[PDB]
Design a protein around this nucleic acid. Structure first.
Lengths: 233, 244, 119, 68
RNA sequence: UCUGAUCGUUUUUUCACUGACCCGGUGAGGCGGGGGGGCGAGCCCCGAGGGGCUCUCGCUUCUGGCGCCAAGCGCCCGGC
RNA sequence: CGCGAAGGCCCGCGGCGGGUGUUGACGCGAUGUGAUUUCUGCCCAGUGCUCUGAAUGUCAAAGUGAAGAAAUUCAAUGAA
């Protein structure tokens, strides 16, 4: 850069009594709407209080790379929707008179959504996979379902998000899903999952029961603990 | 009977405070970053008289360091403070009269006034017309300090709470006999409006169980428990002793 | 920016819509109950209003209680096809708003008086 | 179905889901009133056993009274 | 006769943590860690080249003045 | 004579309620005597007020043991 005639640098001094402080982020200090300080500290309590094993077993979740494999399989076996159930219903009814075809046929395998439908097909030993949303709103809705799956001999896996389990189906959210039957081509793909799912969830179920969470004190509170214990060290 | 005078002094009525003409509160300033680690410099614009108080305040003018305007306070004025003076405020502001700095960074034996109780309440202790709290001996572990309040009771005050140096201006007030009934009247009219007391021994036996009789005599032992119900509790409360 | 520079959180203003009702709340606009023929009740004629009408070049009227001075001008102007310079309106003890209508210099307060019937 | 399991669980009270949860209840009755709308029951079975169904037109308010 | 202190219960006393709860400040404006940087200070070695450690600073106290709405630099893209 | 504010005196049917308090011991609150001058004697037995308390005489809900088949009976322990 060639020399400019009279262009000045003119810096600024920042500090106590010097020029006025700039406008920078106060993300930690802003008085938040007090409806979130409810929902925010609730994230902290579940880190502090001794969360019991029946609940804490909902943090340990199926990995990502395994999750996409399952979500691939569920993409093949989603239930029918409006606007094509409808058209098939248009195809169903209008063919009854002709005599060549008619309304109903055999039902190819599909998923099953509600916990009140899953369980009723679990204690009959009819469910192959059981997928549990890791964060159901009252967590009492599925706080009993793992220990039921082990006692009946069922592979069960926990996925992240009840909203995308609501995309394997076509509703806002779906607590649970369960495979009861599959077709012969994919039957290879299923056994690839349950051979690794049940090695981490069903097989070491006894490891999960003896587990307790919480007591992870705050970083301000724990850095002090380390510093003072360092002092005795 | 009826409620005695001093039993409706809590009803929140005629016995309120007379605070129409009072200039303002008396608080030092909120603790912020510039005061915690450095020191901020302010002018003493004008010293004024705050009615109902023998300790005249002082309009100190500071500068907000994170916006652009002029902020004003009402410090209790120490003694020696005069207008056009640069009052400092913080942790690294040296010792001199009328210049707040937190107890803990001031040497043992330094006289303070308008001392805070707990860090951040902007001045509560030893701020009458000419009183002063003395610092005694720090304890750089557990971060405490011991002050000798004006009464004489030694307090274990938390450190890091601030106190403007020097005695409070207006001292030596109660050395002039008021000398007049009226001159005491004008004094108590400017404050909570409760001046002319009438002894219990004079009122008929409804108010003040003391009263009544045919000789204007108390009749009852003066000293009273503090479990006594609200309405008998008159006279020398909870007397640990009496007599000269 | 406007992400975080101030230490307060305020309500984020949103979009607003105006009423688009699927029917009118009421059937049809309610016609006036206060028109030309109701805000000028009748001319007044006494020994005061006759001096007022022959000398000051003004008229006198009696007018409904709720009527501006801006409204009385229009009524007399439209009623008798006349002009008005200024209007003064006291309200009598009985409760009728007496109105003094100063007449424009281009007109003759007697010749208008004969038309409206008062002598 | 799950409701029998839910029913047999809340019989065994003395949990923490009830202690994790009072704080949710005890605070936000000041951020809003001591009478606000819940979006959906925090007890699914009990609401249903009492007459509540899940269709349109049903509301569920949480209300906080003081003991003594 | 004391034969570990292990996983287990409780009567426990003393101290410590904070998450329940309470108080105070505020326009909730720089809190707890980790290094960049040093007018300097020191602790220590060390080929005088430097290397390891501890202190400090948002670095201002004769003046009733002024102080925001970025200069500078770095990287893109558009018109003509 | 009380009181250093999780305080004194007090209002209140009730709340993170209210007055003194836009206050802080040269202050608020409760009394008695009655300008100044000159003095304010003896009694802590009585009636009050307050101060402390382990070896504690009396001492009520819980709580712990003993007998009974149980309701219960008994005992130790025992705050102000």
């Amino acid at each position: 850069k060639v020399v400019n005639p009279l262009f000045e640098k003119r810096p600024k001094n920042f500090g106590i009594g010097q020029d006025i402080q700039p406008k920078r982020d106060l993300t930690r200090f802003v008085k938040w709407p007090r409806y979130i300080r409810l929902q925010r500290q609730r994230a902290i309590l579940y880190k502090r209080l001794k969360v019991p094993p029946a609940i804490n077993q909902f943090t340990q979740a199926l990995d990502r790379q395994t999750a996409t494999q399952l979500l691939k399989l569920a993409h093949k076996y989603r239930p029918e929707t409006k606007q094509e159930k409808k058209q098939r219903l248009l195809a169903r009814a209008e063919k009854k008179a002709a005599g060549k075809g008619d309304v109903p046929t055999k039902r190819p395998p599909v998923l099953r959504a509600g916990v009140n439908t899953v369980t009723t097909l679990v204690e009959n030993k009819k469910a192959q996979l059981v997928v549990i949303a890791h964060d159901v709103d009252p967590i009492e809705l599925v706080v009993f379902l793992p220990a039921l799956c082990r006692k009946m001999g069922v592979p069960y896996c926990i996925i992240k998000g009840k909203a995308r389990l609501g995309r394997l189906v076509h509703r806002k959210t779906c607590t649970t899903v369960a495979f009861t039957q599959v077709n012969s081509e994919d039957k290879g793909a299923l056994a690839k999952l349950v051979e690794a799912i049940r090695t981490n969830y069903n097989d070491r179920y006894d490891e999960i029961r003896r587990h307790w969470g919480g007591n992870v004190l705050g970083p301000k509170s724990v850095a002090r603990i380390a510093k003072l214990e360092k002092a005795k060290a | 009977g009826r409620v005695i005078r001093g039993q409706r002094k809590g009803a929140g009525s005629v016995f309120r405070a007379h605070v129409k003409h009072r200039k303002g509160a008396a608080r030092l300033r909120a603790v912020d970053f510039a005061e915690r680690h450095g020191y901020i410099k302010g002018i003493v614009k004008d010293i004024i008289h705050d009615p109902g108080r023998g300790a005249p305040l002082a309009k100190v003018v500071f500068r907000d360091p994170y916006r652009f305007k002029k902020r004003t306070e009402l410090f209790i004025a120490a003694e020696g403070i005069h207008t056009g003076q640069f009052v400092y405020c913080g942790k690294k502001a040296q010792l001199n009269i009328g210049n707040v700095l937190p107890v803990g960074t001031m040497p043992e034996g330094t006289i303070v006034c308008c001392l805070e109780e707990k860090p951040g309440d902007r001045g509560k202790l030893a701020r009458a017309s000419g009183n002063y709290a003395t610092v005694i001996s720090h304890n750089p572990e557990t971060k405490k300090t011991r002050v000798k309040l004006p009464s004489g009771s030694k307090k274990v005050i938390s450190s890091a709470n601030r106190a403007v140096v020097g005695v409070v201006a207006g001292g030596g007030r109660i050395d002039k006999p008021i000398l007049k009934a009226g001159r005491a009247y004008h004094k108590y009219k400017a404050k909570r409006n409760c001046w002319p007391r009438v002894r219990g021994v004079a009122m008929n036996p409804v108010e003040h169980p003391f009263g009544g009789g045919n000789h204007q005599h108390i009749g009852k032992p003066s000293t009273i428990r503090r479990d006594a119900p609200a309405g008998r509790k008159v006279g020398l409360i909870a007397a640990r002793r009496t007599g000269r | 920016k406007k992400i975080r520079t101030s230490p307060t959180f305020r309500r984020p203003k949103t979009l607003r819509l105006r009423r688009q009702p699927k029917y009118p709340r009421k059937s049809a606009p309610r016609r006036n109950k206060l028109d030309h023929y109701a805000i000028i009740k009748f001319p007044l004629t006494t020994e005061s209003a006759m001096k007022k009408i022959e000398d000051n070049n003004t008229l006198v009227f009696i007018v409904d209680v709720k009527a501006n001075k801006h409204q009385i001008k229009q009524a007399v102007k439209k009623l008798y096809d006349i002009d008005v310079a200024k209007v003064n309106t006291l309200i009598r003890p009985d409760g009728e708003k007496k109105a003094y209508v100063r007449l424009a210099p281009d007109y003759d307060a007697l010749d208008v008086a004969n038309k409206i019937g008062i002598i | 179905g799950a409701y029998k399991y839910i029913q047999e669980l809340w019989r065994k009270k003395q949990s923490d889901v009830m202690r994790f949860l009072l704080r949710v209840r005890c605070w936000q009755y000041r951020q809003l009133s001591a009478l606000h709308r819940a979006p959906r029951p925090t007890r699914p079975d009990k609401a249903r056993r009492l007459g509540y169904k899940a269709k349109q037109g049903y509301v569920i308010y949480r209300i906080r009274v003081r003991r003594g």
